[PDB]
Unconditional design. Structure first.
Lengths: 100, 89, 94, 107, 78, 85, 93, 103
DNA sequence: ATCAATATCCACCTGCAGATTCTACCAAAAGTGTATTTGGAAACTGCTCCATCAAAAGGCATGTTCAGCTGAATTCAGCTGAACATGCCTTTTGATGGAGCAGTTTCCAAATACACTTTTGGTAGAATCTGCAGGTGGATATTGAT
DNA sequence: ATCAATATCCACCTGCAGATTCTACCAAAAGTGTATTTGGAAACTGCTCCATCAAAAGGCATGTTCAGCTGAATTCAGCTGAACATGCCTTTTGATGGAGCAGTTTCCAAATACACTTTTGGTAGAATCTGCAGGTGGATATTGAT
C-alpha cells in the first residue's frame, strides 16, 4: 500500500478556507510581545504596557498584514502567477502609498 | 515618437483637457446630482476642479502603468487601471 | 475612591433589544459598537465644526449637523439618517 | 415641576443631554443650538440600529443568539455602504470575508 | 457629453503618466473613472454650496470637497 | 532588570506568516516573502509604536495604554475598533 | 473688502533665504495654502492632545508634541529646535 | 514698542497665529509660548521650501519661483514629499520619470 | 560603429505687455498696562494592574526528504495601436450688458449661555443567569490514485 | 467508474466563564430665571457670470499601412508544498510584590478681561521690470543602409 499524499495546493486551499473562516490571532502572543517591547525599548527605556495595548497592536498588525497579503496576491495574479514574491509586496505597498 | 511625447508632456504643467468639454461635463454632473437646479460656477471653481481631476488621472496612470510593467507588458490595459483603483482602495 | 467610566452600552443594548429582541451581545462586540459611536460622533461633530467655521458662524445648529451627515454618509444611509434626525428634531420642539 | 428628558421629548434611546455635553466639551464651536444634540443623537442611534440589524442577522445565520465581533465584520463588509463608511476601520477579532480568487481553484 | 473628453486628451494625460502604449479600451475606462471622481467631488462641493445658502459654486467649496476626501489642492485659497 | 530583547522579529515564524497569507487568500508562497514580511511588519510596528509612545511621553506616563495605541492607529489612517472601553 | 494672508511673511522669508529670487503670484498662492494646511494639522493635533489629557490650554508643549507626531523625522528635529529656540528667545527680552 | 514676532526673532506673525489659535476652536485657553512656537515651526518649513524652490528655479536658470519649482523641490525631497504626499500643487505638473523598461 | 540624412530638442535671443513691486492711506488688529481669576502642577497617597518567575502539558516550529508543478525562458504568428495627412467643427477669445447674486450693514425677537437648585438616570459592584466552547462520534463529502 | 483515505460537517450534550440583571448612591442632566448674543430679515451695491452672439483659430476626427507586441504553445530545471519525527517554547495559571496610574487638595505662575494707544497689513493705482510669445540654429536623438 502506497502512503497517501495530497497534491501541491490541496492543503493550501484547505487552509485558505479554514483561516478565512476564523478570526483568532495568527502570530503567537509571546513572540509578538517581545517584538513590541523591543521596538518600544528602542524609543524610550523602561516602558510598561497595558496588556490591551499589546492586544491592540497585534489586532492592527495582523489586520494590516492580511490586507497587504490580499493586495500582494492580486498583484501576483496580475502577472499570471500563483506564487506571491517580494516584488509583489513592494508593488502593493507602492500603489497603497506606503513607498516610493 | 512616444518618448518625445512623454518627455514633452512631463516637462509641461498646463491643463491637458480642453476647458469647454470639461466645464460642460462638470455642470452636467452637478445638475444630475442636485435633482436639476440652476447652479452657477466660479471660473476658479472649475479650474480647481480640473486641476484636481487631471492630477488624479495622471497619478492613477502612473500606478496603473506600474501594474502594466509588472505584467511584462508596456500597453496599459483597462484591468491595469481597475486593479490600481482596487489596491488604492 | 472609585472611577466612573461612561459609555454607550445601555443605549446600544436598548437599540439591540428593539431590532433583535432575542439577541444579546458579547462585551467585545459591545466595545466595537462603542468605538463606532465615538468614531461617527467625532466625524460628524468635526465636520459640523468646520462647516460653522467656513461660514463665520459661532453656533453649531442641527443644520450644520445635517450637512455634515450628508457629506459623510454614503447615500441612502445619509437619506435615512436625515429622516430620523429631522423627525427627532421636529418632535423635540413640541 | 416634573422632569422629562430630552431623549423622551425627541423619541430617542440615545442620550441627548450627554451628546450635548460632549459637544460643549469638545470645543467644536463657541455655542451649540438646541436641535444639534437631538439630531446628532438620532443619527448615531440610527446608524447603530442599522449595524445591529445586519449583525443580528449574521448571528442567526450562524445559529448564535449573541452577537460577536465576527458578526459585525460580516454585516459591515457584506453591506456596500456600511463598508464604504467604515472602509478605513479595523474590527478587532472580525476576520475577513471568505474570498478565494478563482484562478487559484483546481481546474 | 462625456465624449468631449477626447482620445487625444486622454492620451495626453497618460503620456504625462509615463505610459508608452495605450489599449484602445482605455478611453472608455478613463471616461468612467473621471465620471466617478467628478461625481464624488461635485456632490460634496455643491453640498458645501447649499449649506452656505449660495447658488454659486466657489473655488473654496471645491477645495473643501477635495480636502475632506483626502485630496488636498493647493493654490485656490486653501 | 530583564534579559535584553534582541532579534525578536525572528520570533515571527514562517508558519505564522504563512497563516496570515492564507487568511489573505494566498495559495503559493515564494521562499523569500518571510524576510520581506518581517521587514514590512517591523516598519509598521516602528511607526505605530513611535507615535503611541509619543502620546505616552506627552501624558508624562511610563505605561503605554490601549488609548495611546488607538490614537497612534487613528492618526496613521488605521482606525481600530474595540479597545477604548 | 478685507482678506488676510501670509504673503508678507513668505516674501520676507524668501528675501532672507534667497534675496535674488522672486515668486509668482500663483506660487505665492501655493505657499499660503501650505502655511494654512500645516497650521491646521499642528493645531488640530495639539487640540486632540490637550483633550485626551483633560487639558483646556494649548501650550507650546502641545505644539511640540504635535510637531513630533506630524513631521517626518529630521524635519521634526529642526522644527523642534526652531520652536524651542524662538520661545526661549521670546521669554527673555 | 516692538511686536512679539520681533521679540522671538521671527518674520512670521505671532499675534496673528495666536488670534487664529484663539478663534479656531482648538482649546479654551492658549499659552503665551504656543503661538511663538507654532509661528517658528511655520517659518522654518517655509524657509526650507523656499530654499529648495529657489535652488530648483535657478537650476532651470529662472529668477522667479513658480509652482513648477515648488513641485520639483517638494517631490525631489523625501521628507517634504512624505509630508505633502496627499497634496496636489496646482500648475506644478509631475516629476520627469520614465520607467527604465521603456528605454 | 559609421556616417548619412532627417527631425525635433534646447538653449538663447528681443522688446514690451502684463505681472509685480512701490507708495500711501487707514480701519482693523496687535500691543500695553493694569487688575483679577484660575487651570493645573506638585505633593501627597490608595489600590489597580503590571512585570517577571515558575512549572507542566502539549501544541506547534523546525528541519528533512522529495517530487509535482510552477515560473521562467523561448519561439512565432497574428492582430492591435501608433504614425501618418487633411479639412472641418468644436473650442477659444472677445464683449455687451443684463442680471443674478454674492457680500455688507443695521436691528431686534428668538435664541443660547449659565449659576442655582431639584431630581433621576447611569454606573459600579454584586447577584443571577445561561449561551456556547469544547468535547465527542458518525455522516457526507472530497480528493487522488488504480 | 470506483474505491480507500482523509477531512470536513454537523448534530448533540453540559457547566462555567462570561453576559444579563438587580440595586443604591450620586454625579450630571433637567428645570428655572435672568443675562448675553446672534444670525437672519430687509434694503443697500459692484462684481463676476452667463446668455447669447459672435467671429475664427487650431485641435481633433477620420481612414490606411505597418511595425512591434501581446498571447499562445511549449519545455525543463529547480523551488516550494506535503508529510514526516522531534523536542522546545508557548500557553496557562498563579504567585510575589512593587510601580505607577489615578484620586484629592492646595495655591501661584500663567491665563483672561478690558480700556486704550500704537502699528500693521491690505489695498489700489502708479511706477518698474520679468517672462514669454515666438524666432532662431546647432546639438542631440532617430532611422536606414553599408
Amino acid at each position: 500500500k502506497k502512503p497517501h499524499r495530497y497534491r501541491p495546493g490541496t492543503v493550501a486551499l484547505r487552509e485558505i478556507r479554514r483561516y478565512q473562516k476564523s478570526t483568532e490571532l495568527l502570530i503567537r502572543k509571546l513572540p509578538f510581545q517581545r517584538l513590541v517591547r523591543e521596538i518600544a525599548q528602542d524609543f524610550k527605556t523602561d516602558l510598561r504596557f497595558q496588556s490591551a495595548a499589546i492586544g491592540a497592536l497585534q489586532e492592527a498588525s495582523e489586520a494590516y498584514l492580511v490586507g497587504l497579503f490580499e493586495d500582494t496576491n492580486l498583484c501576483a495574479i496580475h502577472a499570471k502567477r500563483v506564487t506571491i514574491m517580494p516584488k509583489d509586496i513592494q508593488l502593493a505597498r507602492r500603489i497603497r502609498g506606503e513607498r516610493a | 515618437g512616444w518618448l518625445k511625447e512623454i518627455r514633452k508632456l512631463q516637462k509641461s504643467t498646463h491643463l491637458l483637457i480642453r476647458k469647454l468639454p470639461f466645464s460642460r461635463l462638470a455642470r452636467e454632473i452637478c445638475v444630475k446630482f442636485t435633482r436639476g437646479v440652476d447652479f452657477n460656477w466660479q471660473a476658479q471653481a472649475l479650474l480647481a476642479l480640473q486641476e484636481a481631476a487631471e492630477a488624479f488621472l495622471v497619478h492613477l496612470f502612473e500606478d496603473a502603468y506600474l501594474l502594466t510593467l509588472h505584467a511584462g507588458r508596456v500597453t496599459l490595459f483597462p484591468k491595469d487601471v481597475q486593479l490600481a483603483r482596487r489596491i488604492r482602495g | 475612591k472609585r472611577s466612573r467610566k461612561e459609555s454607550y452600552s445601555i443605549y446600544v443594548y436598548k437599540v439591540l433589544k428593539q431590532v433583535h429582541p432575542d439577541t444579546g451581545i458579547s462585551s467585545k462586540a459591545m466595545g466595537i459598537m462603542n468605538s463606532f459611536v465615538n468614531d461617527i460622533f467625532e466625524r460628524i461633530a468635526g465636520e459640523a465644526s468646520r462647516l460653522a467655521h467656513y461660514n463665520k458662524r459661532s453656533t453649531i445648529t442641527s443644520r450644520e449637523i445635517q450637512t455634515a451627515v450628508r457629506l459623510l454618509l454614503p447615500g441612502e444611509l445619509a437619506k435615512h439618517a436625515v429622516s430620523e434626525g429631522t423627525k427627532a428634531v421636529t418632535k423635540y420642539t413640541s | 415641576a416634573k422632569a422629562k428628558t430630552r431623549s423622551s421629548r425627541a423619541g430617542l434611546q440615545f442620550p441627548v443631554g450627554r451628546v450635548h455635553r460632549l459637544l460643549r466639551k469638545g470645543n467644536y464651536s463657541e455655542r451649540v443650538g438646541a436641535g444639534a444634540p437631538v439630531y446628532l443623537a438620532a443619527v448615531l442611534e440610527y446608524l447603530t440600529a442599522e449595524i445591529l440589524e445586519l449583525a443580528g442577522n449574521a448571528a442567526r445565520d450562524n445559529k448564535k443568539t449573541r452577537i460577536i465581533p465576527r458578526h459585525l465584520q460580516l454585516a459591515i463588509r457584506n453591506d456596500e455602504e456600511l463598508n464604504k463608511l467604515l472602509g478605513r476601520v479595523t474590527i478587532a477579532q472580525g476576520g475577513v470575508l471568505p474570498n478565494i480568487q478563482a484562478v487559484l481553484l483546481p481546474k | 457629453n462625456i465624449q468631449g473628453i477626447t482620445k487625444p486628451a486622454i492620451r495626453r494625460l497618460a503620456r504625462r503618466g509615463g505610459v508608452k502604449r495605450i489599449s484602445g479600451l482605455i478611453y472608455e475606462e478613463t471616461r468612467g473613472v473621471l465620471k466617478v471622481f467628478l461625481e464624488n467631488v461635485i456632490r460634496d462641493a455643491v453640498t458645501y454650496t447649499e449649506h452656505a445658502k449660495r447658488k454659486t459654486v466657489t473655488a473654496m467649496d471645491v477645495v473643501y470637497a477635495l480636502k475632506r476626501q483626502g485630496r488636498t489642492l493647493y493654490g485656490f485659497g486653501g
